């Protein structure tokens, strides 16, 4: 017998490296930086905009099925 | 099956590179600079007015769906 | 569907290039210069009176919706 | 007589070091970090992404049948 | 024989993507944000107002019968 | 059959865009700003006074039944 | 049916544009300025004395029921 | 019903244009000027002695209940 | 036949808009505010003193038999 | 029948506008101000000393049975 | 019945206008001034030494049972 | 009953007008003056050496138990 | 017949205003304050040391049989 | 009958004014001051070293059996 | 019975006036002064080096078992 | 039993009067003087170069284990 | 007859002051401190390492059979 | 009988003074310092790097079986 | 048995003295210095660029497995 | 297994010695010098223009992957 936990894993395709879910955060990332940059006017919050992106890239690349 | 996280993403069009949400901050940006410039009279707070703008541009351009 | 962040943006008209909010700072600008010019008697604080004005102009002109 | 608790242990192969079940968490791991990193923008939540991975590795390696 | 769990599913129409039940939360959403925004005056609670809406949209769209 | 969740929705009229409930927060909004402005004397807390208002406007306008 | 959130709104008359509650802050306003002006001797804290007043005026005028 | 925030407002009479509280600052005003005038020997700190006085006068006169 | 759940509803008069039970909380309200205000010295806890009062008013007014 | 929640309300006289319980807080009020004033040496904590007093006055006056 | 919150109020005599507890702060007052005066050498911290004293006097005099 | 806050007040004798604690500051006073006089060579820092001394004297004399 | 719940009430004498049981807490009170004062070094935990004592006094005095 | 809560109260002698338990905190007191003084280098944490000591003294003296 | 909190108090000898633990801070003391003196170059941080030492001395001498 | 805080105190040898750690600061000392001397060209910053050195010497000599 | 609850009490020797079970916690103690010290980098978690040890010592010494 | 809690204590060898588990933290230690040093640029976080190391050394040395 | 915490420690190779993770900070180090140097234009932030580097070197060299 | 922290490091190419990010600061460098040179007219701010450049060069050259 094979493993029955499988089937679909469209879940991947749902969460896939390019999917709906993934992109959203980046917008939030872009938003929240612009958000928090307003009050502080510190150049801080513009980071994961780079980082998160490449983070998720290798992050997803680690497994991503 | 496709990914079911999708549908609309009018959310994009709601947050889209030219949308309501985006522009607001810029005003705040323009405001808060004029705000904080008053007390300090330092030429500092006039930056992201350029930066944030082009920031969000490429920032949105990074993904923006 | 359209973006639901919209509606009014009388907020613009509230913050609009000629609106209530905008003008106030300029007075403060004019005031605070006269303010700080008193103690220093340095010709410094008479600037953004020009600058801020034209600043906000193009500043608002950048987007201002 | 042998032990009758045995048979299959495809359960292993179902939970096996590389199986369906295992990978899912990592995605969640990658997700939730990106999740919680948004609100805090603290570099914290990017850890078990390394840790959990190698954790489960030796963790599974401890027994994993 | 067919499935006898069926019949009506006016329940859908009762919970349907546009129904009574659905809308209520959004008001609460709009309310509670205005609620909690008062004490904190943090721009936080104005989110699901967007999110929940589009959330339920695709959320309902996932199945919604 | 129709949906039985309905009936009244005077609740709307109770929470309606112009109703009792709505206005209260604005006062609180006006109050709490004057409140917190006292201790800080920062021009911050005078915002949602604009924002919340127009916020609820489109916010209610999003659905508001 | 009408909205049952109503009744009294003497609360208004309690918070009304001229009421007890309103005036208090102004005194505090006048006080705290004189307060903080002592230590700094900066002409700063004499502002909302004008501002807050007219602020609350239009502020209350925005809704104030 | 009337507003129940009222009653006493002896608080006024406690803070009243001529009351205990009011006068104190003026002494401090007179003191701190003499204080800070010593170290600087600049004729500066003798101002609000006039200003604060008339300030509070119209200041209290603005509302003062 | 009429409903036999009735009779007395002195319970109302026992809980009535002006009764024993009602008033107690207000004292507690007044107390607990003074209570918690001591430790924090935050102006917070002086609210429901207004709110609860008018709250119960319309609250009782909603039905109160 | 009358309401049986009544009887005594010596509780009032126990909590009465002049009673034991009431006064205590004021001492604490006077204490804690002197307390917290020590560390900060900010003139802040001397307030409710006035406020709380008159607060409880009208506060008790609101109902106080 | 009388109020049972009473009895002793030696607590007063424990906190009384001349008691143990009261005096301590004044020493701290005298100390902390000498403390903080050292680092700043600003004539500031010698105040409540007068103020606190007379403060507590009338402060206690307000009620002090 | 008497006040139980009492007992010892060797604390006085520990902080007493002539005690250990008192004298220390004076040395610091003498030191820090010599300290800060070095860099400035301004005759300033030789003051509380007189002042603090007599300050603490009457200061302690105010109460000092 | 009399009430048979009685007899002994040495329980009182066991819990009596001066008994074993009573005193223990005070020690704990004294201990736990010294306990929690260590970590915080906040002057807080030295209170019920007064309060609890007089609390139990009138507290016991309320009935204490 | 006597109270049976008694017996030993070596517990006192275990917690007694001079016992093991008592002294420990003082060391911690001495330690934690030296601890927290390091990071701040504020002269603050050297207090209860006096205070706690005499505190516990009268504190224990209050009852201490 | 004796007190059972005792035994060892090698803890003393572990924390004893000359022990491991004690000395460490002094090094830190010496270090942190040299640390913070670098950035400020203020002669400040060379104090507890004397003070802490003699502080702990009498400090330990106060009890130190 | 002996004190178990001991063992190694190679920490000393790690921080020892001649160790790695010690010397570093001196370089920084030499550096920062040359650093800050550049901008001011004041002969000031050449001091602890002597002082710190001999400072740490006796400083370490005070205890240094 | 003797007590039959006895026999073995190798349980002691199993839990004995030096046994397997005892030591484990100390490692955990040492571990968890190093654990929690990482995230906070507060010097806190290095305590029971001393305390627990001597704690269990006298703790076991209290009875330990 | 001997104690049956024993056997293996490879757990030691698993946690042993030189084992896998031990070293990890040190890396984290080295990491987190470099981590937190970035944002603050305070020389603080480089400590337990020494301390934790020698800490665990004697710490493990205390028992470590 | 051997210790089962082992296996991989590719984690080392993942965090190894030359690995991905290590280098990143240095860039940040180089960045943040250039970052913070801009606003201050103080020559400060160019340090750990040397320090952190050699820091991590010996730091990793301390254990690094 | 290899280290999974890797992948991309386009991050380098994103931050690479010649990349977008790098150049920006230099402009700011050139700007801010011209900025701050205006007010002071001191020849100071024209430095890192050289320095930062070559700084980042070797700085990046130190590692830069």
Numbering used by the authors:
A (entry chain 2N), B (entry chain 2M), C (entry chain 2L), D (entry chain 2O), E (entry chain 1O), F (entry chain 1N), ...: 6 to 70
Sentences from the study reporting this entry:
Conjugative pili are widespread bacterial appendages that play important roles in horizontal gene transfer, in spread of antibiotic resistance genes, and as sites of phage attachment. The pilus is a polymer of the VirB2 protein (or pilin). The structures of the pED208 and F pilus are very similar, with overall dimensions of 87 Å in diameter and an internal lumen of 28 Å in diameter. Thus, selective binding of PG to pilins occurs in both F and pED208 pili, and thus, the F family of pili are polymers of a selective and stoichiometric protein-PG complex unit.
During the process of helical reconstruction, as the resolution was increased, an additional separate density became clearly visible and readily interpretable as a phospholipid. For the F pilus, it became apparent during the process of helical reconstruction that two populations of filaments were present, differing slightly in the rise between subunits (see below). Instead, two 5.0 Å resolution electron density maps were generated for the two F pilus populations. For pED208, the angle between adjacent subunits is 28.2° and the rise is 12.1 Å, while for the two F pilus structures, the helical parameters were 27.9° with a rise of 13.2 Å and 28.1° with a rise of 12.5 Å, respectively. Superposition of the structures of pED208 and F TraA reveals very similar overall structures (root-mean-squared deviation in Cα positions between pED208 and F [13.2 Å rise] of 1.4 Å and between pED208 and F [12.5 Å rise] of 1.5 Å) with slightly different boundaries for secondary structures. Also, the TraA pilin structures in the two F pilus forms are virtually identical (root-mean-squared deviation in Cα positions of 0.7 Å). Thus, with the structures and helical parameters of the two F pilus forms being so similar, functional differences between them are unlikely to arise but cannot be excluded. The amino acid sequences of both the orthologous pED208 and F pilus TraA pilin are similar, except for the F pilin N terminus, which is 4 amino acids (aa) longer. This longer N terminus could not be traced in the F pilus density maps and thus must be disordered. Indeed, the presence of phospholipid in the F pilus was also confirmed by MS; however, this time a PG species, PG 33:1 (16:0, ΔC17:0), was the major phospholipid observed in the F pilus after PLA2 treatment.
